[PDB]
Design an enzyme around this catalytic site. Structure first.
Site, PDB file in Angstrom:
ATOM      1  N   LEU A   1     -38.070 -31.026  89.843  1.00 21.52           N
ATOM      2  CA  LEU A   1     -36.891 -30.206  89.655  1.00 21.52           C
ATOM      3  C   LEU A   1     -36.017 -30.827  88.565  1.00 21.52           C
ATOM      4  N   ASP A   2     -35.485 -29.981  87.673  1.00 23.06           N
ATOM      5  CA  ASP A   2     -34.601 -30.405  86.594  1.00 23.06           C
ATOM      6  C   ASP A   2     -33.188 -29.987  86.962  1.00 23.06           C
TER       7      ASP A   2
ATOM      8  N   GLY B   1     -28.670 -30.752  86.315  1.00 23.29           N
ATOM      9  CA  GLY B   1     -27.609 -31.219  85.421  1.00 23.29           C
ATOM     10  C   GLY B   1     -27.081 -32.595  85.863  1.00 23.29           C
TER      11      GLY B   1
ATOM     12  N   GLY C   1     -31.594 -35.447  86.157  1.00 25.69           N
ATOM     13  CA  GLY C   1     -32.392 -34.698  85.193  1.00 25.69           C
ATOM     14  C   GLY C   1     -33.753 -35.317  84.973  1.00 25.69           C
ATOM     15  N   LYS C   2     -34.831 -34.507  85.091  1.00 24.19           N
ATOM     16  CA  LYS C   2     -36.237 -34.931  84.948  1.00 24.19           C
ATOM     17  C   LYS C   2     -36.745 -35.679  86.204  1.00 24.19           C
ATOM     18  N   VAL C   3     -36.081 -35.457  87.357  1.00 24.88           N
ATOM     19  CA  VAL C   3     -36.450 -36.071  88.640  1.00 24.88           C
ATOM     20  C   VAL C   3     -37.597 -35.298  89.318  1.00 24.88           C
ATOM     21  CG1 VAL C   3     -34.104 -37.039  88.892  1.00 24.88           C
ATOM     22  CG2 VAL C   3     -34.722 -34.924  90.137  1.00 24.88           C
TER      23      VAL C   3
ATOM     24  N   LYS D   1     -37.835 -40.816  89.966  1.00 27.57           N
ATOM     25  CA  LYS D   1     -37.550 -40.640  88.544  1.00 27.57           C
ATOM     26  C   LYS D   1     -38.283 -41.694  87.739  1.00 27.57           C
ATOM     27  CE  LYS D   1     -34.712 -40.440  84.648  1.00 27.57           C
ATOM     28  NZ  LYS D   1     -33.927 -39.195  84.498  1.00 27.57           N
TER      29      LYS D   1
ATOM     30  N   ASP E   1     -18.803 -46.649  86.779  1.00 27.13           N
ATOM     31  CA  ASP E   1     -19.289 -45.321  86.392  1.00 27.13           C
ATOM     32  C   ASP E   1     -19.033 -44.278  87.509  1.00 27.13           C
ATOM     33  OD1 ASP E   1     -20.712 -43.570  84.490  1.00 27.13           O
ATOM     34  OD2 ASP E   1     -22.714 -44.254  85.165  1.00 27.13           O
TER      35      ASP E   1
HETATM   36  C1  LIG Z   1     -34.482 -41.663  91.375  1.00 26.15           C
HETATM   37  N1  LIG Z   1     -33.176 -42.185  91.037  1.00 26.15           N
HETATM   38  C2  LIG Z   1     -32.777 -43.383  91.619  1.00 26.15           C
HETATM   39  O1  LIG Z   1     -33.470 -44.040  92.384  1.00 26.15           O
HETATM   40  C3  LIG Z   1     -31.386 -43.810  91.228  1.00 26.15           C
HETATM   41  N2  LIG Z   1     -30.835 -44.672  92.247  1.00 26.15           N
HETATM   42  C4  LIG Z   1     -29.467 -44.802  92.375  1.00 26.15           C
HETATM   43  O2  LIG Z   1     -28.647 -44.171  91.724  1.00 26.15           O
HETATM   44  C5  LIG Z   1     -29.054 -45.757  93.345  1.00 26.15           C
HETATM   45  N3  LIG Z   1     -27.766 -45.980  93.717  1.00 26.15           N
HETATM   46  C6  LIG Z   1     -27.811 -46.964  94.659  1.00 26.15           C
HETATM   47  C7  LIG Z   1     -26.596 -47.479  95.308  1.00 26.15           C
HETATM   48  C8  LIG Z   1     -25.632 -48.072  94.346  1.00 26.15           C
HETATM   49  C9  LIG Z   1     -25.915 -49.285  93.739  1.00 26.15           C
HETATM   50  C10 LIG Z   1     -25.035 -49.835  92.828  1.00 26.15           C
HETATM   51  C11 LIG Z   1     -23.869 -49.156  92.538  1.00 26.15           C
HETATM   52  C12 LIG Z   1     -23.586 -47.949  93.156  1.00 26.15           C
HETATM   53  C13 LIG Z   1     -24.463 -47.396  94.066  1.00 26.15           C
HETATM   54  N4  LIG Z   1     -29.060 -47.331  94.849  1.00 26.15           N
HETATM   55  N5  LIG Z   1     -29.842 -46.571  94.019  1.00 26.15           N
HETATM   56  C14 LIG Z   1     -31.385 -44.475  89.869  1.00 26.15           C
HETATM   57  O3  LIG Z   1     -32.292 -43.844  88.961  1.00 26.15           O
HETATM   58  C15 LIG Z   1     -32.047 -42.468  88.893  1.00 26.15           C
HETATM   59  C16 LIG Z   1     -31.376 -41.954  87.798  1.00 26.15           C
HETATM   60  C17 LIG Z   1     -31.145 -40.593  87.707  1.00 26.15           C
HETATM   61  C18 LIG Z   1     -31.595 -39.749  88.705  1.00 26.15           C
HETATM   62  C19 LIG Z   1     -32.271 -40.271  89.797  1.00 26.15           C
HETATM   63  C20 LIG Z   1     -32.509 -41.633  89.904  1.00 26.15           C
END
Ligand SMILES: CN1C(=O)[C@@H](NC(=O)c2nc(Cc3ccccc3)n[nH]2)COc2ccccc21
Ligand SMILES: CN1C(=O)[C@@H](NC(=O)c2nc(Cc3ccccc3)n[nH]2)COc2ccccc21
Lengths: 259, 263
Positions: free
Chosen positions: A14-15, A17, A18-20, A34, A127
C-alpha cells in the site's frame, strides 16, 4: 529480532502519504514492512544496524510504536513495525466525520504519555509531527519515527519545518532537547483543532515570534488548550514546560471536563 | 524538601488542602519530635514522591510536627477495589477490563523503577469517582522508616494473594513474579466480586492447599469471564515463579484483547 519473508503467509503493498508493505506473519499477525535500501550486502555497518533494531525494540510503551524486527536477505534491508489501521493523525483529522472533542482530548494526553516515556528513556524525537502520530481503528495513537531521525544507522543506509523549534531553524548545530519536542507538540495541538497543516521569509517570521494563528481554528477548542499551545511554543526554550509537567495539568483537566 | 505544614488543613484523618483539594492522612506516630531521625523519614518520603504515574498513588507530603508524624496523599472517594465490586450497582466488563489494564500499567511502572510491591491485593487498589484506579501501599510494606515508626513502644501506635513460595517453609525474599501471582488472584476476585477460598475451614489447610497447587475456583467465574482472561490468570498463578509472565509481557497480551472485545 530478525524475520524472514517466508514467515509471512501473505502480503500486500500500500502507498500512503510511502512505499510500505503490509504482511500477515504466522504467529504474531499483521505488521508493516518497508525496504530501506536495495543493493549488495554491506560489510562495514551490518553489526550495529542489528543493534539499532534491538535498542528500538526495547522502547515498549502503549503510546510508542514498537519495531518488531528486521528482514535482511539477498541484498535487502527492511524494518518491520506494528500496524495502525487508520494511518496518521492528519489523515484522521481531514476525514468527513469530525473527531469528537473527547477523542481529540484523549489523543493529546496519549501524545503526552508517549513523549514523557521517550524522554525518561533518554530519547529526543526532534521530528514530532502529525505524519509521525499513528492512529489505530479504536482512535488510540502511537508515536513513530518514520523519517529515521532517531534511526542513525538505518538513516545512512539511504521534511516539515512547521513543527521545528525556532532554536533549530538557521542553527543546525544546536543540540535537540526535551523543549524542542514541546514546541512540536504545541503545533500538533493547533493542527488537531484547526484540522489542517499551519501556514525563507516564513523561517525569519517563525524566528521573530510568528506562530500558527489561533483565529484560523474554526471548530470548538477550550481556552485552556489555547493557553497550553501558546506556553509550549514560547520563544525561550527555558520558559516551555516539560511533558510530565504538561501531564500533571492536562490529565486533571481531561478527566474533569473532556472524558 | 516536600514537607507539608498543618496550617493549610483542618482536623478529622481527612482534610481539605487549600489549592490541592481533598486529602487523606495517616498519623503514624504521636510523640516527641527529634531532627536526627527525621531526615531518614523525609528522604524515604521524597523517594515515594518520585514514583509518578497515573495508576500509582503519589505521596504528596509528610507532616513532621510535635506529637504528629503524618503521611499525606489524595483521597480516593470510592475506597478500595473490593468495596467497589461488592457494591449493589453491578460493574460492567468494560469498566472491569479497564481496571485490570490500569493495574498492569501501574505495576509495569513500579517494576521498571525496581519497586516490588510485596502486598498486592484489592485493599491496595484504590478507586476514584471516574472508576479509574491507583496502586497504593496502605500497609506501609515499602515504607521501611515509616513502618518502623508505626511499631514503636514510646508511641500510641494478605494470605489469599500471597505467592506459594512465601507461604513455604523456605520463605525466600520477594521478586517481581511474587507480584504477578497476587495479580492473578485479584483478576479472579474482579470477576467473582468476592474474596477467594470461601469453602476453606482452616488457615493451615489453606496454606498447604496453595503450596500443593490449589487456586481460586475457576467454575465460580465462568459467569462471565472470557477464556482469554482465565488462561491469563492461570499463567500468572503458576507454581514456578520463573514460569509467570512479566507485567510488560501481560500488558502486550491484555491491551489488544481489551481494545477489540471490551473498550
Ligand atoms: C516500516 N517502518 C518502520 O519500521 C518505522 N519504524 C518506526 O517509525 C519506529 N518508531 C519506533 C518508536 C520510536 C523510536 C524513536 C523515536 C520515536 C519513536 N520504533 N520504530 C521506520 O521505518 C519506516 C519508515 C516509513 C514508514 C514505515 C517504516
Ligand atoms: C495517608 N496515606 C498514605 O499516604 C499511604 N500511601 C500509600 O499507600 C502510598 N502508595 C504509594 C505508591 C506505592 C509505592 C510502593 C508500592 C506501592 C505503591 N505511595 N504512597 C500510606 O499510609 C496510609 C495508610 C492508610 C491510609 C492512608 C495512608
Amino acid at each position: 529480532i530478525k524475520m524472514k519473508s517466508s514467515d509471512f503467509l501473505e502480503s500486500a503493498e500500500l502507498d500512503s502519504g510511502g512505499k510500505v508493505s503490509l504482511a500477515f506473519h504466522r504467529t504474531q499477525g499483521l505488521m508493516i514492512m518497508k525496504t530501506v535500501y536495495k543493493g549488495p550486502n554491506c560489510i562495514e555497518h551490518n553489526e550495529a544496524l542489528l543493534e539499532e533494531a534491538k535498542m528500538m525494540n526495547r522502547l515498549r510503551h502503549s503510546r510508542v510504536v514498537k519495531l518488531l524486527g528486521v528482514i535482511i536477505e539477498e541484498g535487502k534491508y527492511s524494518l518491520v513495525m506494528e500496524y495502525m489501521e487508520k494511518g496518521n493523525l492528519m489523515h484522521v483529522l481531514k476525514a468527513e466525520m469530525s473527531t469528537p472533542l473527547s477523542v481529540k482530548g484523549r489523543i493529546i494526553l496519549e501524545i503526552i504519555e508517549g513523549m514523557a516515556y521517550l524522554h525518561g528513556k533518554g530519547v529526543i524525537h526532534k521530528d514530532l509531527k502529525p505524519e509521525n502520530i499513528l492512529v489505530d481503528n479504536d482512535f488510540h495513537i502511537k508515536i513513530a519515527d518514520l523519517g529515521l531521525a532517531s534511526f542513525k544507522m538505518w538513516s545512512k543506509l539511504n521534511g516539515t519545518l512547521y513543527y521545528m523549534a525556532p532554536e533549530h531553524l538557521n542553527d543546525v548545530n544546536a543540540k535537540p532537547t526535551e523543549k524542542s519536542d514541546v514546541y512540536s507538540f504545541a503545533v500538533v495541538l493547533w493542527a488537531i483543532f484547526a484540522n489542517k497543516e499551519p501556514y525563507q521569509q516564513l523561517i525569519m517570521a517563525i524566528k521573530s515570534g510568528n506562530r500558527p494563528d489561533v483565529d484560523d481554528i474554526t471548530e470548538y477548542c477550550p481556552r485552556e488548550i489555547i493557553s497550553l499551545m501558546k506556553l509550549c511554543w514560547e520563544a525561550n526554550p527555558e520558559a516551555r514546560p516539560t511533558f510530565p509537567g504538561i501531564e500533571e495539568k492536562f490529565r486533571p483537566f481531561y478527566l474533569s471536563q473532556l472524558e
